[PDB]
């Protein structure tokens, strides 16, 4: 059920497999042949999207999110059809690389590149939930003593795509990162 | 001020605001007037905001009416360019006028003849009343003043954005301020246009 429609990388095998059956039905056509045959998700976890709804999240093994969107665009536009009523968007799966400066063990490699820290992975999370519309600002606001809010501003000419999906991002970010973000669309020079 | 569009912007003001020349102040600008402009010429003058003008003018009316009992507020110049206007504003308002020649110490010196006890200070212009404005900062009585782009603006609490150089504009200002203040007092219930015309407040070398 997961031949190359779901490369195996973790323990559970439940909903990503049906999603993969949908993917293999999609890859029969002249825009997804051998392009939806290789970058296929491995895990998928159910969470909410906003209020009164729900949806499914896809974890690629994530060496792929560079060249993954070039099929993920077709993937949303042609699998929101067959799993409508919910939402799909590509995620960077990171368990986490734990903090380097705390150590007593040897099977945890000895130097940390930044690209595995908590912060770089977090900007990777923001990229994940909005790939096609770029981020054109980040003003960070403080709530009620020190709690967090993040206003984030996106490209004006790229609203044409994710506006009925306006709360979905900040819905996912709460579980992925833990705080509250909003997405406005500023003035352009 | 106000949420009544009838007190607010109407043609009833512009038909005379453009007639006088109320949309031009002067060449240069002090750093305390940027609140009251919208456009700039290619010709060396700044064209003030008449809407903000009427805004702070109606606030000026609010201040003038918060005078709970009118006998106790001074309207002042010492320049004849607004001497006639202040005289004919006080004569019909009730609050006392001073114009032409002032005497330092009248409301500052403890012992004084013409020791007057105002409760608000109205000045034609800060560049026109040097000493009385300082004495208004000396005694706890608020200050209302016209304001040009050029003019120094110190100690000004209530600002009226307009050119104060010219008899025509300043006469429009007094002549419409009187109506506005009495309007918000309520003696004028939008029953009439007021029969006095702005030639009355354009200063005269009296030969009539």
């Amino acid at each position: 059920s997961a031949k190359i429609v779901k490369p195996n990388g973790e323990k559970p095998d439940e909903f990503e497999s049906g999603i993969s059956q949908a993917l293999l039905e999609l890859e029969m056509n002249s825009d997804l042949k051998a392009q939806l045959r290789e970058l296929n998700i491995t895990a998928a976890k159910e969470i909410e999207v906003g209020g009164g709804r729900k949806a499914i999240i896809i974890f690629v093994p994530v060496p792929q999110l560079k060249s993954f969107q070039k099929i993920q665009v077709r993937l949303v536009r042609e699998l929101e059809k067959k799993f409508s009523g919910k939402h799909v968007v590509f995620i960077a799966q990171r368990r986490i690389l734990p903090k380097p400066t705390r150590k007593s063990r040897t099977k945890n490699k000895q130097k940390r590149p930044r690209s595995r820290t908590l912060t770089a992975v977090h900007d990777a999370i923001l990229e994940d939930l909005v790939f096609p519309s770029e981020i054109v600002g980040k003003r960070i606001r403080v709530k009620l003593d020190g709690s967090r809010l993040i206003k984030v501003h996106l490209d004006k000419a790229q609203q044409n795509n994710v506006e009925h999906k306006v709360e979905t991002f900040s819905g996912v970010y709460k579980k992925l990162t833990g705080k509250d973000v909003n997405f406005e669309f500023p003035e352009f020079q | 001020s106000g949420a009544l569009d009838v007190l607010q912007m109407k043609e009833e003001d512009v038909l005379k605001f453009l007639a006088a020349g109320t949309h031009l102040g002067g060449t240069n600008l002090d750093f305390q007037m940027e609140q009251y402009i919208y456009k700039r010429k290619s010709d060396g003058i700044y064209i003030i905001n008449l809407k903000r003008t009427w805004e702070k003018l109606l606030l000026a009316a609010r201040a003038i009416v918060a005078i709970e009992n009118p006998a106790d507020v001074s309207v002042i110049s010492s320049r004849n360019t607004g001497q006639r206007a202040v005289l004919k504003f006080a004569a019909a308002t009730g609050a006392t006028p001073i114009a032409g020649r002032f005497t330092p110490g009248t409301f500052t010196n403890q012992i004084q003849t013409a020791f007057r006890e105002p409760r608000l200070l109205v000045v034609t212009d800060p560049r026109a009343d040097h000493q009385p404005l300082t004495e208004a900062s000396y005694v706890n009585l608020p200050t209302i003043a016209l304001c040009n782009t050029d003019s120094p603006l110190r100690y000004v609490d209530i600002a009226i954005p307009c050119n104060n150089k010219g008899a025509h504009s300043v006469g429009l200002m007094w002549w419409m301020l009187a109506r506005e203040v009495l309007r918000m007092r309520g003696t004028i219930s939008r029953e009439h246009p007021w029969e006095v015309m702005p030639d009355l407040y354009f200063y005269r070398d009296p030969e009539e």
Binding site: - | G2, R154, S189
Partner: protein, 83 residues
Amino acid sequence: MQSNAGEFVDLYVPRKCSASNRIIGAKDHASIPMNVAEVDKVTGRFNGQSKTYAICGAIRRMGESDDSILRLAKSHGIVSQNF
């Protein structure tokens, strides 16, 4: 104030100036708590309520008082017009 057990911190409350969110001293002269009439807004007529303005004394010399009371009136909602 006068707390219950006598944690006496105020002999009284001096007139606080809100036009710049700053307190003044006892011996001032330009901290002027002017009154402003309230309108009825059935004709715009004066009616019996107070819009007050008491700025810290020293700002008048800088001549920011007009601007500060502009902000105060706009916020107070007796002035609504904004370009």
